[PDB]
């Protein structure tokens, strides 16, 4: 129980986030404070080394802000002092009255107490667990149960190793899903920029930090624009506003968590012929088969990704780049085709931007419909509009193009891995040849019979 409690550190942060999120009606000031706290937490997480320098202080400050909010809630019950505050500040108390200077119902009182009470519980947990205990906590850890635990630890380690690829894939998946659900300024643009920064390795950590910052900015804008007041257009203002950026914010948080987990794994790592191995047994051949198969056959894999998306999407511009792909296949030389790919990568990126711009419609400058789109005797008709992508009174068509684009970008990244394939002498070393093969005329290896 003591060990579990010591390891129960992130729970306080999760509870604070939960209190911040979906706290019934939003007490504008309280909601703003919660969002600011979340943003500060993200900034510290990026700062992590700096956050390590000032983490307990951050927790104490969060507790202090919660206490201040609760005290303010008590203060607004009195009426003379809020009037005094209005007089000194010069803004109306009508806004605060909308917020509610009065002690509201059992649900409201219970929620407010729980938020301050949750803050008190979190502060107590913070006092119980020192920053050094958290640093030690980063490391993690009848007979069958112990063996299972050891196997699980080995797995966890493998997951940490694969985390870089998994994280990139997850970030892309979240971006694509968000774009498919909704397309908005900076929303798709951030994903596109991230795709721009995926090829270069060194920018990629900074790019991740900046993508997280952009996601935070988008979430902040959504929170500010959670409702529409003026009613005098590129605005959500969803009444429930359950998850405008919640999926995106969660994805960013998961990525940061993966990064921190990677740091912990690296700290632990500080602590403490393959081909014939293939011939030996199931585990060896399978592990070799999986890693080698993907790193060498990523060209084939991308070919599959391209073919599947091309069939599923079925549009003309998508088909033309597919035609580029078949032109690529015409060449039978791996080296020459490889030389050709980087320019094709640039071409696919241009395709990504072009396709998104085509999806875009109703420019913010003009409220009424398009000039070029016509009910006149212009040669175009309903067939083009069904094929073309422009929101109107009638339709804004299918967004399968984005999922196909996702496949395209990931393939580009995999192509960069292929670039590492001709390079990376140590890894490629595993990958003349006719002389070894004859020996297994009918090799007795269990694997050999199947092969």
């Amino acid at each position: 129980v003591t060990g579990i409690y010591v390891k129960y550190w992130i729970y306080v942060c999760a509870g604070m986030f939960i209190v911040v999120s979906f706290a019934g009606r939003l007490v504008v000031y309280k909601i703003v404070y919660m969002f600011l706290f979340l943003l500060c937490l993200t900034l510290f997480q990026v700062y992590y080394t700096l956050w390590r320098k000032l983490l307990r202080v951050f927790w104490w400050l969060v507790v202090a802000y919660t206490m201040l909010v609760l005290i303010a809630v008590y203060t607004f019950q009195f009426q003379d002092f809020p009037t005094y505050w209005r007089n000194l500040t010069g803004f109306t108390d009508e806004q605060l009255g909308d917020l509610g200077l009065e002690q509201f119902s059992v649900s409201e009182l219970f929620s407010s107490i729980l938020i301050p009470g949750f803050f008190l519980l979190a502060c107590i947990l913070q006092l119980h667990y020192f920053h050094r205990p958290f640093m030690q906590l980063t490391d993690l850890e009848l007979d069958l149960a112990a063996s299972f635990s050891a196997v699980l630890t080995r797995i966890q380690v493998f997951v940490r190793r694969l985390l870089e690829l998994h994280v990139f894939k997850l970030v892309a998946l979240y971006t694509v899903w968000v774009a498919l659900k909704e397309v908005s300024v900076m929303n798709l643009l951030l994903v596109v920029l991230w795709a721009f920064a995926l090829p270069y390795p060194r920018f990629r950590p900074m790019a991740s930090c900046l993508s997280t910052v952009w996601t935070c900015i988008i979430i902040v804008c959504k929170m500010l624009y959670q409702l529409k007041i003026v009613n005098p257009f590129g605005v959500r203002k969803g009444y429930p506003n359950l998850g405008y950026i919640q999926n995106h914010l969660q994805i960013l948080l998961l990525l940061v968590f993966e990064a921190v987990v990677y740091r912990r794994q690296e700290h632990y790592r500080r602590q403490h012929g393959t081909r014939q191995r293939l011939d030996q047994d199931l585990l060896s051949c399978l592990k070799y088969f999986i890693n080698f198969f993907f790193y060498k056959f990523g060209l084939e894999i991308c070919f599959l990704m391209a073919v599947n998306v091309i069939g599923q999407r079925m549009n003309f511009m998508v088909i033309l780049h597919g035609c580029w792909l078949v032109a690529i296949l015409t060449r039978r030389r791996r080296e020459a085709i490889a030389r050709l790919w980087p320019n094709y990568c640039l071409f696919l990126t241009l395709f990504l931007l072009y396709q998104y711009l085509l999806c875009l419609g109703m420019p913010p400058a003009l409220c009424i419909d398009y000039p070029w789109r016509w009910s006149k005797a212009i040669p175009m008709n309903s067939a083009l509009i069904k094929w073309l992508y422009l929101p109107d009174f009638f339709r804004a068509p299918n967004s399968t193009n984005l999922i196909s684009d996702f496949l395209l970008l990931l393939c580009a990244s995999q192509q960069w891995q292929v670039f590492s394939a001709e390079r990376t002498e140590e890894w490629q070393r595993m990958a003349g040849e006719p002389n070894p093969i004859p020996n297994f005329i009918h090799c007795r290896s269990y694997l050999d019979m199947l092969k």
């Binding site: 056959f297 084939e300 070919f303 599959l304 073919v307 599947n308 091309i310 069939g311 599923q312 079925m314 549009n315 003309f316 088909i319 597919g322 035609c323 078949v326 296949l329 015409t330 039978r332 067939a383 083009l384 069904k386 094929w387 040849e433 006719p434 093969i437 004859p438 297994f440 005329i441």
Partner: protein, 123 residues
């Protein structure tokens, strides 16, 4: 291998070319239905077309995926064992011929021993 791979590669070229061609027919069919419905009323008998506005080209696409896996296998040099097999074909028949005729001979020759055994009763 060189000739077979190039010619077969052309076969794959045919496959992907068909991919592009059906995409073309499908897109044109979807965009315009009225003129095509009116004349392609008979052409629809010639060729059935696409939906009103499991689905998609799934069986062919997957055949393509497996086809891709196999061409790569073909490209590899693991065929040397196979190569023995192919050359091997050239010489079996004669031996099997003899084996076959010998078996018939053996059967007929074996047949004769039983009657001398019958003669053995006579003996």
């Amino acid at each position: 291998t060189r000739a077979q791979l190039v010619l077969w590669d052309c076969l794959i070229l045919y496959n992907v070319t068909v991919i592009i061609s059906k995409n073309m027919l499908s897109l044109l069919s979807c965009v315009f239905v009225e003129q095509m419905q009116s004349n392609f009323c008979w052409v629809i008998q010639l060729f059935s077309l696409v939906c009103t506005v499991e689905a998609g080209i799934i069986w062919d696409s997957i055949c393509f995926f497996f086809l891709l896996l196999q061409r790569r296998i073909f490209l590899s040099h693991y065929f040397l064992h196979v190569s023995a097999d192919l050359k091997a074909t050239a010489l079996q028949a004669s031996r099997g011929f003899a084996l076959y005729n010998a078996a018939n001979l053996k059967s007929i020759n074996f047949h004769r021993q039983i009657e001398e055994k019958s003669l053995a009763q006579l003996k």
